Amino acid sequence: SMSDHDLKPNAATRDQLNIIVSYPPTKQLTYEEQDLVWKFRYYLTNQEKALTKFLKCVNWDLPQEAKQALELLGKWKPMDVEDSLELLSSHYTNPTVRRYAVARLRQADDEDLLMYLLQLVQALKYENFDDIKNGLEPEQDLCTFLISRACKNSTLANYLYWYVIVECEDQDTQQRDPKTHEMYLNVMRRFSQALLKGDKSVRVMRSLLAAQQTFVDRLVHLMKAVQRESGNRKKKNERLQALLGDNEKMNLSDVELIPLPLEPQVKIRGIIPETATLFKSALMPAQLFFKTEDGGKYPVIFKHGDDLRQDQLILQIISLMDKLLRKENLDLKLTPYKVLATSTKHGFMQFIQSVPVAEVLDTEGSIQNFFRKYAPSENGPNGISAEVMDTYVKSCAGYCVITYILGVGDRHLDNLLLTKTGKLFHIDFGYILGRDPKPLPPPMKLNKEMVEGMGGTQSEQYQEFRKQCYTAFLHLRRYSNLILNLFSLMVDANIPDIALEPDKTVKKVQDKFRLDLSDEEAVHYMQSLIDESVHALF
Ligand SMILES: C[C@@H]1COCCN1C1=CC(=O)N=C(N2CCCC[C@@H]2C(F)(F)F)C1
Known part of the structure; x- marks a missing residue:
């Protein structure tokens, strides 16, 4: 009756909790919100998605709160893999929390773990350096877990070796952060040592x-x-x-x-x-x-x-x-x-x-001429094989959305490549996150040649393109937590366009999702982007 065990939110409080829980992982909770989450902590243990919010509410300096926080962590409905990534950032030093992250991360299969490994190697920067060193010959942490999966999977071992060796050979890290350089040297040694104890x-x-x-x-x-x-x-x-x-x-x-x-x-x-x-x-x-x-x-x-x-x-x-x-x-x-x-x-x-689109224009005059030459079809759209045009529209849509989200600049026509099967793709990511060699880059990186390749703004291909853009955008928004948590682990990386503004990097990706909008509004916004871009092209 003075206990918190049984506190039960009304309808209005539940709606406010659902808002807080549905926040993206980067959203800072107010003191009011922190108090509310804490108050109904027992109620929230039925929600796997509320655990990251709960852990953001704990005053870790109050021994009382910290102990009860760890009690609840053990009792919480278990955190999903995508969310465990948040616990591996520089925000968390608490050993039990960091080990919990690994315990939940372990649930991923090797296929998924490989998709995250690059970030996971960066995340070793946020682990206990002493523990990594002391594991050398005189409840896993991240270092132990990665090495352990690598011992059993030669693909994982391969990428772990190369990702860590590059860190070992980083002279910037060596000069600027010697302890971190030393840590990676220890990871390599720990990995070698583990392999040598194997069969x-x-x-x-x-x-x-x-x-x-x-x-x-x-x-x-x-x-x-x-x-x-x-x-x-x-x-x-x-x-x-x-x-x-x-x-x-x-x-x-x-x-x-x-x-x-x-x-x-x-x-x-x-x-x-x-x-x-x-x-x-x-x-x-x-x-x-x-x-x-x-x-x-x-x-x-x-x-x-x-x-x-x-x-x-x-x-x-x-x-x-x-x-x-x-x-x-x-x-x-x-x-x-x-x-x-x-x-x-x-x-x-x-x-x-592949062939750069610049060379296509030079040798054939247009993308459509290119396709008609290499994939002619009498009754296909504009005389082009339907499969090829279908591939073109899809790959155009996909890259439109992906380069928009990643803020890819320097989009000259030698950096857009085409295959004879109809695939378009981007290369050369020297300018990202809104950077460009010339001022005022447009939010969307669409060009006349690409639009003309699909038959102009009056074709059904153009309509299929816009539709596919909408769909791709809505799907990637659904994975915003994962994607943002992965970029969060990159903030301290020696990558030029991140290192310019480490603290603004994640926001630059997040804004592109327009998470503030519903799916219906998001589609409208994307439609508006494409219309404005293409209008400005003609
Ligand atoms: C590897 C990818 C995919 O296959 C096609 C070529 N691609 C390219 C990606 C890239 O970032 N840059 C490339 N070019 C080629 C033109 C000259 C400069 C530059 C490079 F590597 F040779 F230095 C090519």
Whole structure:
């Protein structure tokens, strides 16, 4: 009767709690709201979604409140994976809470865990550094949990190795935050130590990590020699090919099967010497074809003297977004090509056969001419195969929405690529979150050429495009908590456009969701965006 156990909100209080619980994870609760959540804490234990709000209400400095908070945490209806990500941010230091996050995160399968791993490696920054160190030879934390899943899953192990090694080689971290640099060095050692206690298969997996590392080391050596060559591009290409061709010297053309770092499920036995060339751009990245196990080939870009990490983040988010859309039965024919940094200054990208829209205009005059040339169909829309046009409309819609949310700038027509199957996709994420090389970038990154490709503002393709934009936008809004919680874990990352304003990064994504609007209003807003953009184009 003086107890809180049985307090029961009326209809009006329930409606106010439902508002508070439905807030996005970034919304700061007022003192009034905090008091209200606390008051009906026992009532809220039936709501998994109320737990993150509850934990934001605890005065941790009051021993009384802290103990009861942890009692309730144990009794709460269990938190979902997407929400556990919030507990791994810099806001939470409480050991029990952080371990609870891991306990709930463990419920994810390996497929989902891989979609979040990049962020989870950043989140080690917010863990107990002493505990990580003390686990070295003289209820899991995050470090123990990741290593434990990696020991049992060679894909996870592969990405854990590379994500952590890049952190280990970050000279910015080393100079600016030596304790954090030291922590990542300890994670690597903890991972090695764990692998060495494993069975024979795990010890072999470990040795194949090492074999990848030395393969990349040798590729770095090769690129230094090529980039230092005095002569023209043809001479550099000859030197690139000769060095690749000399397996005795460089051990790059024929090696024992190792996982491709970029895609570890694909095993490779070296690089084809004679088809390796440099791109005609200032930093001289190479196009390399890998020899795959089944006798096939896998083209990549290997960049040296260039930081891929912003592109790595964005392609990892695009991958996530595509997966979420597919989860809701929407396949918009996207191209989330792989990107993996092997250091702060080099890395791999998956090369997709394609043509820049600039070159399409130059060689064929328009996107539609391109399609009519390569996919003619007498009775298809504007003489184009229906499947191809369908793929074009879908992929256009998908990228329209995704680049809008991510604030992707520098959208010149060499950064929009097209395939002959009709896929359009974006590359080159050097400007994100509203940045652009020229002033006043538009909210939506649509161009005349793209609209004309689908037959103009008077076609049914155009209507299908707008519809697909609406649908994609509503689906991605439904995953706003997940997406925002993932960006929250990136705030301290050495990624240029985040590091400009760490504290405003998440807001810049969140605003694009227009969470303040209902689904009906959201559709209207998106319609209005597309109309305004396209109107301004003509
Ligand atoms: C890898 C992805 C997907 O497959 C197609 C090419 N793509 C590109 C992505 C990217 O960010 N930049 C690219 N270009 C190519 C034009 C010259 C500059 C630059 C690079 F890498 F060569 F330096 C290409």
